[PDB]
Amino acid sequence: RIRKYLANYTQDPSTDNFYYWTCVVTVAYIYNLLFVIARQVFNDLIGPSSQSLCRFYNNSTTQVECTYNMLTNMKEMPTYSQYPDLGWSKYWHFRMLWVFFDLLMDCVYLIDTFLNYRMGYMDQGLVVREAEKVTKAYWQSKQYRIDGISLIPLDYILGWPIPYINWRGLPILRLNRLIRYKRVRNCLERTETRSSMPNAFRVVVVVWYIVIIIHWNACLYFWISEWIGLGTDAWVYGHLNKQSLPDDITDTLLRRYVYSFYWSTLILTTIGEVPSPVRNIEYAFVTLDLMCGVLIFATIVGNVGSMISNMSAARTEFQNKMDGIKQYMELRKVSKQLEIRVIKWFDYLWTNKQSLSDQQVLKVLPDKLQAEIAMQVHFETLRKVRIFQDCEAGLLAELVLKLQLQVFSPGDFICKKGDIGREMYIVKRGRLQVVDDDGKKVFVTLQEGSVFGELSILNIAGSKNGNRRTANVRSVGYTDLFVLSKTDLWNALREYPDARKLLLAKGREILKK
Amino acid sequence: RIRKYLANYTQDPSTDNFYYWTCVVTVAYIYNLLFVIARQVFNDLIGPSSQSLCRFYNNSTTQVECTYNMLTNMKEMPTYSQYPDLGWSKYWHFRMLWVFFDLLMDCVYLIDTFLNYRMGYMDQGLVVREAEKVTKAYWQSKQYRIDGISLIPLDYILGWPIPYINWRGLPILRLNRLIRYKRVRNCLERTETRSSMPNAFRVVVVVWYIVIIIHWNACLYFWISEWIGLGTDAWVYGHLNKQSLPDDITDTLLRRYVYSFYWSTLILTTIGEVPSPVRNIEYAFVTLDLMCGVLIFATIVGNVGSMISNMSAARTEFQNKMDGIKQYMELRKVSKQLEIRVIKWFDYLWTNKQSLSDQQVLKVLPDKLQAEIAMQVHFETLRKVRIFQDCEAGLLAELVLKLQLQVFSPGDFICKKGDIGREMYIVKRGRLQVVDDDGKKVFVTLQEGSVFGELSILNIAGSKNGNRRTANVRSVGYTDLFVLSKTDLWNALREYPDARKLLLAKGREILKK
Numbered sequence A, B: 001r002i003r004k005y006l007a008n009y010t011q012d013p014s015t016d017n018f019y020y021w022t023c024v025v026t027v028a029y030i031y032n033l034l035f036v037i038a039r040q041v042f043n044d045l046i047g048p049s050s051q052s053l054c055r056f057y058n059n060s061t062t063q064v065e066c067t068y069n070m071l072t073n074m075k076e077m078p079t080y081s082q083y084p085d086l087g088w089s090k091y092w093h094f095r096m097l098w099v100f101f102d103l104l105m106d107c108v109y110l111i112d113t114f115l116n117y118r119m120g121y122m123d124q125g126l127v128v129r130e131a132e133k134v135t136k137a138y139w140q141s142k143q144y145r146i147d148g149i150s151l152i153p154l155d156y157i158l159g160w161p162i163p164y165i166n167w168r169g170l171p172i173l174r175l176n177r178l179i180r181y182k183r184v185r186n187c188l189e190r191t192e193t194r195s196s197m198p199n200a201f202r203v204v205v206v207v208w209y210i211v212i213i214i215h216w217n218a219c220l221y222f223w224i225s226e227w228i229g230l231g232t233d234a235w236v237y238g239h240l241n242k243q244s245l246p247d248d249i250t251d252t253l254l255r256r257y258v259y260s261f262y263w264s265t266l267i268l269t270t271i272g273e274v275p276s277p278v279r280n281i282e283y284a285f286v287t288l289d290l291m292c293g294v295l296i297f298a299t300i301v302g303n304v305g306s307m308i309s310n311m312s313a314a315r316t317e318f319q320n321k322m323d324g325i326k327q328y329m330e331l332r333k334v335s336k337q338l339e340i341r342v343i344k345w346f347d348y349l350w351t352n353k354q355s356l357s358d359q360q361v362l363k364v365l366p367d368k369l370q371a372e373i374a375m376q377v378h379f380e381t382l383r384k385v386r387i388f389q390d391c392e393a394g395l396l397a398e399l400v401l402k403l404q405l406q407v408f409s410p411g412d413f414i415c416k417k418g419d420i421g422r423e424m425y426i427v428k429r430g431r432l433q434v435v436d437d438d439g440k441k442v443f444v445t446l447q448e449g450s451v452f453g454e455l456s457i458l459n460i461a462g463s464k465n466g467n468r469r470t471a472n473v474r475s476v477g478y479t480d481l482f483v484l485s486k487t488d489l490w491n492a493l494r495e496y497p498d499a500r501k502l503l504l505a506k507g508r509e510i511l512k513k
């Protein structure tokens, strides 16, 4: 039942449902930001509480409710006379819509604080899920302070126009909802880690921040204009600011917000193609704001420049290494054929994402993950070497750990006859061929997964011939061999005496047969 | 007594009181900067020395003292006639306030030069505190030159309006106080090192620098305007510059400073929404200044971009390593379950600030601090291993030096039965459990501080069973083991023969019992 379910329920913060929940809370938070400030400053978003009265010349000049032709080409700004009921009779639908969305976002906040109440914390690697423990951890922490301050329903009594007590509402009392920024920061970071484009996403959330700052600065500009007085000088929004209200432009709520947003965009991006301040207070406001806009522009430039620098760092490092090679081959007077070979191979493995090293896995991962990855890649290929057929899998784990990559280019010789042989080669991503002394392919091409040199790695007596390679091997195209050194194999064998017995016996039997 | 105290007193420059003193000296220095230049250029900050006379049409046009309605909508700039006593009778209170603050800051300078006189210097690690020595070091150095030049009381005779000799003061003679910038630079660096936000603090002191430069450039703009003549053209402050003095704006000292600061902000940030120069000298000034403003804007952008690049360097490096791992696991065709395991573990220790290495302590600290830190973390946990109970603490210091961290993820196996055992594990930050061959937890979970494998690390004969693990151990959650290799223990033991005897005896006794 829902009773027992909500009685015993606890939350795990690392789920995929909890991430979606943090996204929902972020939606509610953005709602609060934008529309609390907008409803405070503009306050026609809920419907006008007052009636705009314009002085109109019909017979004679009288004061009547402004039409849209009275709000165009104004010679003075209209005056307002409140309604008896502060617009409630004719805008109750707009105000009920606003109340519904406020209640929806506060229900989101209540669900979020319930999930914080029953919140599983990580103790000794595990996530604790015993309710008693999570609620005790909640109460011992001071999360309930922030969860309660951010939900104080003060804006439901004093945030709306009450005509009985002649109270015209204070929508700014909902700014305590903006204290739950911790879950928004988590959602943004958990989205950055999941994003297939983290640099782009970082710059995108920065421009979202800048757009929200432009919105708040637009509201600040219009609040300062309304406090000073609209149409009083050529800087505040009004009829004397001929950029606010040009010739055939009507003074509407959309016009107020649109011009304020444009003004704020021009100021905070340091473009400044807006009217100059007139009064000392406007000069102070605009100076401070232009300094904030210099800092905002510098922040945008810095974030975009950091993104550009990060996304071109690998190419830069590759170019540095290639230029070092070029400079060396010029200082030491290297033949041009070898130089074009070097440059061809460099460009080849730059157009194939190779990095020439297992050092990423080696450095950054723990030995457990490194061993598991090496076992996945190399074990089933090292189980078919015909000397490792019946030896302990721990030996093969040790070996698959010590497998060194070697790359080759077309026509390169892996080994020539009469050439000390201290190695075993496992073919990946290529095709070798054994040749009769720079002649025709004699017997076989080595496709992927094949091995060559598995018997020149054991120290058997006499054999038939030295520690000399005895065969020619050249790559047809670009091969990617994996190399098992002799010292590494013999270390792993000194760790395993019975494996050494089996290996030596099988090698001797292979050579005799 | 104060006599003996000041006779024998010497100063240690590394105290917390001396840092507060450098902050006081920085306050005095900033006072000098701002208000010496402001009092030179504007010089109504001490009270007007002259009387502004306006041509006023009452009956007829006469020249009378300007009111505030005569300084609005001016058709020409007012003319000035000095007082007999240069405003002293009616502004002696303002001038006495200025004199008091000047004397206060010069007392700060005198205390500072006394502390420089009795200044303890660092000689052979210690701070010398013998007065004779510190005063001899002061006199042998040439600090007294700067301490004396910066305190020359020339501005007390020639810096104020003297009506007897018709001298109107030269407040710029106090610019020698601006030579003590060394203590200001120390205070700023000592505050940067103490600051919990060094990047933010660096950018903040840079914007303080920019605000001071804007202040000095505002004073320079108004001094050039006054030298050319006020109201002579449409670039200098005055009545022909309709941005300085719009319609209903009064010409006051506040207006002069406010407009000059706004002009300087627009010029030095390369916004340039100010009137164009009219004369060749104004063109030269504005060109040079706009070039300085280009450099200032580039400096702001560079500092903010450097702060942004520094504070996102760890995330960038982590992302580079994770992308390298992804690219490797795509090139080698790794199973997707292992890839989601790898990514989960990566994100886990990126959301826990782990860094997987003790290499910070290893690289950057001296062996003394490294040994002390390792002793604090590991000694009391290595004293309870039941083989290290009665062995020399030097052996255990050697050991706590060589303890390697190993991390594990939930369900990972630390060791399986029949698995070469060359190691000892010390549990931290996790909980293991021994299991009956992938079945149920058999006997015990290993909470933190527990040890496993302490007997598979000694080379005792026969024992009961090999060097084989003999037990299964898997982590319940994310465990953080500490690993004591066999080679390291046996090196530390070869350094200690008696410790080896005790260890082998106790191991044999443990196994027999």
Ligand code: NA
Pocket: A273, B273
């Ligand atoms: Na312009």
